[PDB]
């Protein structure tokens, strides 16, 4: 019996702890609003420029990103490059 009363008290205290978690979540909501504003402002600047410019910027970014990714993954023995539509082989 005593252990059930003890666990009951733990759950009561945990409900208040969840109130503290909610306070964290409301501060997180404020931070999320801030980051959402950042994403919105960035999207606005970029959308306005690309609406008339086109996707040329994006193509160049993809090319240089391919270079960066190949470099970043160069020091990795756990990465293997396979051709599109290969078959079977281990090594």
């Amino acid at each position: 019996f005593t252990e059930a009363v003890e666990a009951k008290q733990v759950a009561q205290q945990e409900a208040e702890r969840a109130r503290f978690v909610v306070e964290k979540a409301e501060q997180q909501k404020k931070a999320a609003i801030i980051s959402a504003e950042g994403d919105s402002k960035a999207a606005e600047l970029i959308a306005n420029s690309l609406a008339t410019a086109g996707d040329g910027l994006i193509e160049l970014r993809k090319l240089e990103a391919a270079e960066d990714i190949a470099y970043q993954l160069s020091r990795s023995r756990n990465i293997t490059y396979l051709p599109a539509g290969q078959s079977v082989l281990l090594q």
């Binding site: 409900a15 994006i58 970014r61 960066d68 990795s76």
Partner: protein
């Protein structure tokens, strides 16, 4: 036995209260998402190129992560842009018209 389980159910009553607190947490997060959706979707409704650029950035960030990962990664060689003789080579510039 049953009375001990009834006291466990009393604990579960406090767990119902805990679920109510979890509900408030969930609603707060949803409010954040709704406000973000208005702001961001407005901008992206004109031109989603931001998403494209963000996807590129995501690729780079992911490559930094998996560069130090314990995972075993098999990955298409098309990412090496080495096949200059295929039909895909021109697609990017073809998209630009």
């Amino acid at each position: 036995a049953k009375q001990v389980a009834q006291q466990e159910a009393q604990r579960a009553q406090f767990l119902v209260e805990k679920a109510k607190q979890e509900q408030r947490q969930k609603i707060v997060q949803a409010e954040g998402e709704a406000e973000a959706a208005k702001m961001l979707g407005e901008a992206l409704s004109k031109n989603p190129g931001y998403i494209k650029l963000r996807k590129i950035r995501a690729a780079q960030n992911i490559s930094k992560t998996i560069a130090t990962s314990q995972n075993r990664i098999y990955l298409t060689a098309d990412n090496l842009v080495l096949n200059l003789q295929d039909e895909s080579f021109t697609r990017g510039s073809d998209s630009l018209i």
